[PDB]
């Protein structure tokens, strides 16, 4: 996260961490939607251009964390996957369209003060909250800056970071790039004229973009950190997968057993 | 836990046994539990590797007991098996299937303990390289 | 929206943090989100 601050303990109990078994390495972020379902971006698993093609046997999810390199006995729970579902229409050749994946844990995790599911947007919730100007929150253990002089260590954080970014109007998002923007994505960030800045960066790609509802006080995940051109560049915004737009698909792969 | 089966698991392959079987690892069965503590001294059939595993919260062990574990040739398939003997002469076999490990931080491992009494018991455990304060110092317990 | 058989537990009580919402405490930056709801006429 670029231009954010250390997140308090338990700030977002739905922040999952995609971890690689061997070598140990942080791969991406994710979101806990239920005690046995975790949401993330497709490119964290499948992305041929980088040789990425992970299977349920290559990763494990670490939930309840705060520090990124440290194993936290009192709060952390390590879980394994049983199945990985990636969107059939996931477009990695072009623009990372429908960049979304749904992961199923082998056995339900144990909810606690550090582990708890975020809500998925409703037809009314999406309507009342997805408005240019309203802010959302992005959390992750990805880089604190687009580059480093000597080593990546300089930009890697020790704990979970938090940045609040405003929703930007689609026309602006479209005018900021020469890359095709689709309905399955939205952008957020500060316009150059606003004396503020902040962005998601490499290592945050599955983390949730959430917004707290003024109506019922619940946190809804409106997006998934997907892509951008660099991190925190002026005139550039971060593109998140429009979760509400792919809501029907989610329900379709979840409800596949006697119901 | 009931359902886990280290037998049908898959080891990490790039595991360098001597980087692991060296030093002290602390293993708790829960955040709170601090009793019983039990010190197990492991010796790998080869380059010694006198590793001290301090296990905490395992209700099956007595609080003031020490175990001497020696590596055996059993379970040749991607598994490291050890026979452990104690001050009270308990004895049981412990098989380790290493899943993921950073020899200087922590290690996720599937363990099968087989007490001479009630056999077969699988559980995914996490060995820590750093003592979680409340843990007894290996020097005190070992 | 989801069942519970396949979905699992969590939905009916989603979005409320045990250490914050459930404890009547608000994090350091919530105010920033609420003011972003200001709407000038």
Swiss-Prot record, chain B:
Thrombin inhibitor. Forms a non-covalent complex with thrombin at a molar ratio of 1:1. Inhibits thrombin-induced platelet aggregation. Prolongs thrombin clotting time and activated partial thromboplastin time. It only minimally suppresses the amidolytic activity of thrombin. Inhibits thrombin-mediated fibrin formation in the host. Inhibits thrombin-induced endothelium-dependent relaxant and contractile responses in host blood vessels. Inhibits thrombin-induced mitogenesis in host vascular smooth muscle cells. The keyword Disulfide bond applies. Disulfide bonds join 6-110, 39-142, 69-84. The lineage of its organism: Eukaryota, Metazoa, Ecdysozoa, Arthropoda, Hexapoda. It comes from Meccus pallidipennis. One of its GO terms (molecular function) is serine-type endopeptidase inhibitor activity. Keywords: Blood coagulation cascade inhibiting toxin, Disulfide bond, Hemostasis impairing toxin, Platelet aggregation inhibiting toxin, Protease inhibitor, Secreted, Serine protease inhibitor, Signal, Toxin, Vasoactive. InterPro entries: Calycin, Triabi/Procalin. GO terms for biological process: blood vessel diameter maintenance; symbiont-mediated perturbation of host defenses. CDD domains: lipocalin_LTBP1-like. Changing residue 86 to G: In clones TR12, TR28 and TR45. This is Triabin. Belongs to the calycin superfamily. Triabin family. It is found in: Secreted. SUPFAM superfamilies: Lipocalins. GO terms for cellular component: extracellular region. The sequence shown is that of clone TR5. Expressed in salivary glands.
Curated annotation (Swiss-Prot), chain C:
The chain holds residues 339 to 366 of 625 of the full protein. This is Thrombin light chain. It comes from Bos taurus. The gene is F2.
């Amino acid at each position: 996260i670029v231009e954010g601050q250390d997140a308090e303990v338990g700030l977002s109990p739905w922040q999952v961490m995609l971890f690689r078994k061997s070598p140990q390495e942080l791969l991406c972020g994710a979101s806990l939607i239920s005690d046995r379902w975790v949401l993330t971006a497709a490119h964290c698993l499948l992305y041929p251009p980088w040789d990425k093609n992970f299977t349920v046997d290559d990763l494990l999810v670490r939930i309840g964390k705060h520090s990124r390199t440290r194993y936290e006995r009192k709060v952390e729970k390590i879980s394994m996957l049983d199945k990985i579902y990636i969107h059939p229409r996931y477009n990695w050749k072009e623009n990372l369209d429908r960049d979304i994946a749904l992961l199923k844990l082998k056995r339900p995790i144990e909810l606690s003060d550090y582990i708890h599911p975020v809500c998925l947007p409703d037809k009314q919730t999406a309507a009342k909250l997805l408005h240019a100007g309203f802010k959302g929150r992005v959390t992750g253990w990805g880089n604190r800056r687009e580059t480093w002089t000597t080593s990546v260590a300089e930009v890697q954080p020790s704990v979970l970071q938090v940045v609040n970014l405003p929703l930007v109007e689609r026309p602006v998002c479209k005018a900021s790039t020469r890359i095709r923007i689709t309905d399955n994505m939205f952008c957020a960030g500060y316009k150059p004229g606003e004396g503020k800045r902040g962005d998601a960066c490499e290592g945050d790609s599955g983390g949730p973009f959430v917004m707290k509802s003024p109506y019922n006080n619940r946190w809804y995940q409106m997006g998934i950190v997907s892509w951008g051109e660099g991190c925190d560049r002026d005139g550039k915004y971060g593109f998140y997968t429009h979760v509400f737009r792919l809501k029907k698909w989610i329900q379709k792969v979840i409800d596949r057993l006697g119901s | 836990a009931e359902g886990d089966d280290c037998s049908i698991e898959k080891a990490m392959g790039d595991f360098k046994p001597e980087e692991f079987f060296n030093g002290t690892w602390y293993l708790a069965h829960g955040p709170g539990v601090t009793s019983p503590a039990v010190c197990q001294k492991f010796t790998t059939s080869g380059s010694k590797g006198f590793t001290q595993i301090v296990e905490i919260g395992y209700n099956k062990f007595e609080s003031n007991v020490k175990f001497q574990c020696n590596q055996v040739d059993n379970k040749n398939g991607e598994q490291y098996s050890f026979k452990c003997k104690s001050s009270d002469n308990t004895e049981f076999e412990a098989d380790f299937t290493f899943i993921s490990v950073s020899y200087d931080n922590f290690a996720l491992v599937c363990r099968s303990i087989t007490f001479t009494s009630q056999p077969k018991e699988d559980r995914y455990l996490v060995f820590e390289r750093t003592k979680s304060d409340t843990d007894p110092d290996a020097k005190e317990i070992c | 929206f989801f069942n519970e058989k396949t979905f699992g537990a969590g939905e009916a009580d989603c979005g409320l943090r045990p250490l914050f919402e459930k404890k009547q405490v608000q994090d350091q930056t919530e105010k920033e989100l609420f003011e972003s709801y200001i709407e000038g006429r």
